[PDB]
Design a protein around this ligand. Structure first.
Ligand code: ADP
Ligand code: ADP
Ligand code: MG
Lengths: 55, 438, 155, 433
């Protein structure tokens, strides 16, 4: 036999900020759709947290 | 056998002795009387435990011998070791290695604890068999195999080169109950499940065994690391900071380092990596601080990393050190406006007798009722500390004459042998010319 | 070294994505109960982030990202079916063809949902096919109040 | 987040015309002072004048530090704001004038563009080349590259114990080599290896990243006065043998000024003049004020805000010279004085309500009136500080709000400065000294 489960997950603060920024940039729909999918996947797909070093 | 900690001045104080409503009991946890001051101390203790308001200052003011330091020690004992409690004297901030402001900053940041909680995979088991094969000559790859056992499991592990080196360094043998952390590879031996072979010589007396661990082999355990802000500052100031944590010799830490550390701790708190554990800094005899130290306190209490500050002073209207200004408690009015003051009232006869009884119970001294009455009269006439000292003195005198209970005669003997301040001053007046100056 | 350069904490990878936390919980439960997991995602960069997360958490994994050579695919399949240590097998839904026989696992986790339910069905049948002797559980992760709810509704 | 003394101050509460709203951004009164501080904020944002000094003068409790922090909040986190207390110039390591100069340079910030060169990949070959250089081969998910690196980098790699199969990070600018772990592909070979595994890098072997760095002039001065960038034995020796601060010379500061001007001309740097704040200025001595004369007359200096609550007081370091704020008249001639006034009871009630809201405390109208009455006598600070204990009392008694009985009980438990002074005066013979 097989069973199917659907699990709901919440967004982090960075994910929420990126999603809101893109939804504000909405006002093409396909590009916004892809960016929102990437945000929901992981914000590191856009820019990783920097490695900080002295100047 | 006597531990390093013995019967001191405040050894009988186990807490403030309050109930759920912060109502002070008459005699509980060593504290007797001082009901209003103990209630205020309990309110302050609840404020400390909540840990939400930074830079709160409380001043315990009263006559000498009224229990200011007793209340501070009761607060410290009621807080518990989880919350930092830095107790220093006012004179300690005057240092030849660092500025007064630097010493005050270090005192503040020793009273804030940073706690990091992480989960790690842990292997704890009894070593059954360990085999290590190494090349006879020259550099080569060591190959090994390790068998670990619990009450319900037994797994054979193939070992890598670095784990082989770690096991060799730790000298792990069969029957040793060892703990292995998978990430760091650290191995800690915690006992032997059984003895080694008897036929071996020069082995020494075998110690007691340790029962084999139960449950699964690879568990997951929570590791908690707690340091203060001062420790972080010291280990980040310079490479030798870890040694400066023990030798002192920290110098003056740059403000840039402290600002960076504050920012990083805030980031950890926002990200849930670390929790901040605000504590208390207790400056006993705060009147020894000068005007510059008070001015620094004024603005240093306005930071969000500041702990709760508790001061004790027995000064009235006194000159502020470093100035020619008379102020209440020896403290400038600008700092006195930033703090709540807790007054301690003098003790009555029954409170004095109860304190003497608690002290005798702490020192394991048996005393008669008449001796208690005489000692209470002396304590009321002279001071509480003199009666407290005469407790032990009379105990020793009674033990010298092969007695069991301290009588009035022993108290009279120690009253004759040892003098208080008043009688000493009288006898010095009687022979004023013999003493050197004035 | 610590005073000379600072790298982002590997913990912050999971902290920045709720999906990663939920998947960590699910994978810990699955490893506790003694199962093997297939993780399907539409993006190879998501495969990289999953590699980082799994290596941080200690889950051994194999990878087939659709750019691997064909001769390596059969070797990876045989290794995964033969090796019991490999906890997870991250895969891309659009890749693998139909010739992959992943009956070794018993759990499939869809990191993100495809617009076409046929691709998800093929990903499931990669493990639910004939000759498989364990119950198969399918876990789908969806972000609340996001586009993924629309994707699931369309599917 | 813990609640501090100024946590409610979010801005100056000014309108578009520069006038001060009565209650806004956590500020209740001081409309004239707030308008003056808005003018000062515009001056700081202009980035044209140098060494302009402002003195916030008034009795304690009149929100001088609140106004300074409001200026800081109005400027933003980009503009440097260095808060210092007058007692901090008395260091046992460097002279007081050096401390003042260091805080002056700390107030001037510099946003500089930098490019980072990164070598990141799994090590496949580590071949020494006889002083012995190293030839290294790095592979990623995108390709492979062979590099020849300096002997210092080889020594760093040896110190990191980098061997074939390890994932490493090299920063070409600083020569900083970090070994991150054994590659994930080898995590199955053994069962107990005592290693931390790391995935293969998914970019290129050689990367260039451009980032914005926030630094100050003081940071450059320190980096050039106690150097630690050479990674040689002499730098370690100097760090270990001479850890104390030093009196940085004017020559080093001139060289750093030239370097920063060259950077700005190249277009890769932006200057943020920033603000220095000295809170307890009266704690400075006459030497510090005399130095501050010339320091403020400098064309490099930032905008300095001073605060003082002293009246006609003797200047520290002098025998009996008395000046209006503890500040010699020469320095007072170089400052713009902002006057803060005492608060009316209505303003006291407003501030108490704002602080109660900030601390998450519900207070009844009767309790609020009683606490404002308590603050009319005693001080505003004392009245504000009774909020948390009263909340704790209400919580103990099971009430979710503060009533007048709780305020009365707290005021009975805790004395103020005047009540304690009365007690001390009544019992002067019993207290020490
Ligand atoms: N209320 C009290 N209950 C119990 N012991 C007390 C109390 N007050 C004072 N003592 C004891 O009396 C001794 C002297 O009191 P102390 O707190 O040193 O006075 P001060 O406030 O002048 O420092 C201490 O050993 C203390 O334990
Ligand atoms: N105008 C105001 N509005 C709101 N709160 C104020 C105001 N002025 C002062 N306060 C509060 O009163 C307290 C005293 O302010 P502070 O700046 O320390 O006084 P001063 O600097 O004059 O000694 C601070 O906690 C501050 O938050
Ligand atoms: Mg004391």
């Amino acid at each position: 036999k097989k069973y199917e489960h659907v699990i709901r997950c919440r967004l982090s603060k960075r994910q929420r900020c990126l999603y809101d920024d893109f939804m504000a940039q909405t006002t093409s729909v396909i590009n916004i759709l892809m960016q929102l999918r990437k945000v929901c996947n992981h914000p590191n797909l856009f820019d990783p947290r920097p490695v900080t070093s002295p100047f | 056998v006597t531990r390093i900690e013995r019967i001191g001045a405040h050894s009988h104080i186990r807490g403030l002795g309050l109930d759920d409503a912060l109502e002070p009991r008459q005699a509980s946890q060593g504290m007797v009387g001082q009901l209003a001051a103990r209630r205020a101390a309990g309110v302050v203790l609840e404020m400390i435990r909540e840990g939400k308001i930074a830079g709160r200052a409380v001043l315990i003011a009263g006559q000498p011998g009224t229990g200011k330091t007793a209340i501070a020690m009761g607060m410290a004992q009621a807080l518990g070791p989880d919350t930092p409690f830095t107790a220093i004297a006012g004179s300690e901030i005057f240092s030849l290695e660092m500025s007064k402001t630097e010493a005050l900053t270090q005192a503040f940041r020793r009273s804030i604890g940073v706690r990091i909680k992480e989960e790690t995979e842990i292997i704890e088991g009894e070593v059954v068999e360990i085999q290590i094969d190494r090349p006879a000559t020259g550099t080569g790859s060591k190959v090994g195999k390790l068998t670990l056992k619990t009450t319900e499991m037994e797994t054979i592990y193939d070992l890598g080169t670095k784990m082989i080196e770690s096991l060799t360094k730790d000298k792990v043998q069969a029957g040793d109950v060892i703990t292995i952390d998978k990430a760091t590879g650290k191995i800690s031996k915690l006992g032997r499940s059984f003895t080694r072979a008897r036929d071996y010589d020069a082995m020494g007396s075998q110690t007691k065994f340790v029962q084999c661990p139960d449950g699964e082999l690879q568990k997951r355990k929570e590791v908690v690391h707690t340091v203060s802000l001062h420790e972080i500052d010291v280990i980040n100031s310079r490479t030798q900071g870890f040694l400066a944590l023990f030798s002192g010799d920290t110098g003056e830490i740059k403000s840039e380092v402290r600002e960076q550390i504050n920012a990083k701790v805030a980031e950890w708190r926002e990200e849930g990596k670390a929790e901040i554990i605000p504590g208390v800094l207790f400056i006993d005899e705060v009147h020894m601080l000068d005007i510059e130290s008070f001015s620094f306190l004024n603005r240093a209490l306005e930071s969000d990393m500041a702990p709760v500050l508790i001061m004790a002073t027995n000064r009235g209207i006194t000159r502020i050190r470093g100035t020619s200004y008379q102020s209440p408690h020896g403290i400038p009015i600008d700092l006195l406006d930033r703090l709540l003051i807790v007054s301690t009232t003098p003790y009555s006869e029954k409170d004095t007798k109860q304190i003497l009884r608690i002290r005798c119970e702490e020192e394991d001294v048996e005393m008669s009722e008449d001796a208690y009455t005489v000692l209470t009269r002396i304590g009321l006439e002279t001071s509480l500390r003199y009666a407290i000292q005469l407790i032990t003195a009379a105990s020793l005198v009674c033990r010298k004459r092969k007695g069991t209970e301290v009588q009035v005669d022993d108290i009279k003997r120690v009253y004759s042998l040892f003098l208080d301040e008043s009688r000493s001053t009288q006898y010095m007046k009687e022979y004023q010319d013999a003493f050197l100056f004035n | 070294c610590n005073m000379r350069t600072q790298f982002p904490d590997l913990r912050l990878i999971q902290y920045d994505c709720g999906k990663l936390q939920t998947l960590a919980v699910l994978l810990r439960q699955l490893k506790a109960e003694g199962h093997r997991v297939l993780i399907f995602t539409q993006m190879t960069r998501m495969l990289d982030v999953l590699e980082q997360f799994l290596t941080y958490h200690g889950h051994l994994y194999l990878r087939l990202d659709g750019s691997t050579r064909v001769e390596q695919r059969q070797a990876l399949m045989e290794r995964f079916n033969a090796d019991k240590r490999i906890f997870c097998f991250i895969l891309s839904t659009r890749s693998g063809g139909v010739g992959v026989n992943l009956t070794g696992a018993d759990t499939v986790v869809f990191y993100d949902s495809d617009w076409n339910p046929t691709m998800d069905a093929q990903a499931q049948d990669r493990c639910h096919r004939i000759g498989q002797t364990r119950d198969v559980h399918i876990y789908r992760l969806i972000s609340e109040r996001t586009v993924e709810e629309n994707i699931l509704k369309k599917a | 987040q813990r609640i501090a003394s100024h946590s409610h101050v979010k801005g100056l509460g000014l309108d578009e015309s520069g006038l001060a709203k009565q209650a806004a951004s956590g500020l209740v009164g001081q409309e004239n002072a707030r308008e003056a501080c808005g003018v000062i904020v515009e001056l700081i944002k202009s980035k044209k004048m140098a060494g302009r000094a402002v003195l916030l003068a008034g009795p304690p409790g009149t929100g001088k530090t609140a106004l300074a922090l409001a200026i800081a909040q109005e400027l933003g986190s980009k503009v440097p704001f260095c808060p210092m207390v007058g007692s901090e110039v008395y260091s046992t390591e460097i002279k007081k004038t050096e401390v003042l100069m260091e805080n002056f340079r700390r107030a001037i910030g510099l946003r500089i563009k930098e490019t980072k060169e990164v070598y990141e990949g799994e090590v496949t070959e580590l071949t020494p080349c006889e002083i012995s250089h190293v030839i290294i081969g790095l592979k990623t998910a995108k390709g492979t590259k062979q590099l020849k690196l300096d002997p210092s980098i080889f020594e760093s790699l040896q110190k990191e114990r980098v061997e074939a199969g390890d994932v490493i990070y090299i920063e070409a600018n600083s020569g900083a080599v970090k070994r991150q772990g054994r590659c994930d592909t080898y995590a199955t070979e053994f069962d107990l290896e005592a290693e931390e595994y790391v995935p293969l890098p998914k970019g290129d072997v050689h990367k260039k990243k451009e980032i914005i760095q926030d630094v100050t002039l003081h940071d450059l001065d320190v980096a050039n006065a106690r150097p630690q960038g050479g990674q040689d034995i002499l730098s370690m020796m100097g760090q270990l043998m001479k850890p104390k601060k030093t009196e940085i010379t004017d020559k080093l500061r001139g060289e750093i000024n030239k370097v920063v001007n060259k950077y700005i001309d190249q277009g890769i740097a932006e200057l943020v003049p920033g603000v220095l704040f000295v809170d307890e200025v009266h704690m400075l001595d006459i030497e510090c004020f005399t130095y501050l004369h010339r320091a403020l007359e400098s064309s490099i200096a930032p905008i300095v805000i001073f605060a003082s609550n002293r009246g006609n007081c003797v200047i520290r370091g002098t025998e009996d010279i008395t000046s209006p704020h503890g500040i010699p008249l020469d320095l007072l001639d170089r400052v713009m004085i902002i006057r803060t006034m005492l608060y009316t009871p209505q303003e006291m009630k407003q501030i108490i309500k704002i602080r109660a809201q900030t601390e998450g405390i519900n207070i009844s109208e009767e309790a609020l009136n009683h606490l404002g009455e308590i603050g009319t006598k005693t001080t505003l600070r004392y009245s504000v500080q009774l909020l948390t204990p009263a909340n704790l009392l209400a919580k103990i008694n099971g009430k979710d709000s503060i009533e007048k009985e709780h305020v009365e009980e707290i005021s009975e438990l805790f004395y103020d400065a005047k009540s304690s002074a009365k007690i001390l005066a009544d019992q002067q013979d019993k207290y020490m000294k």
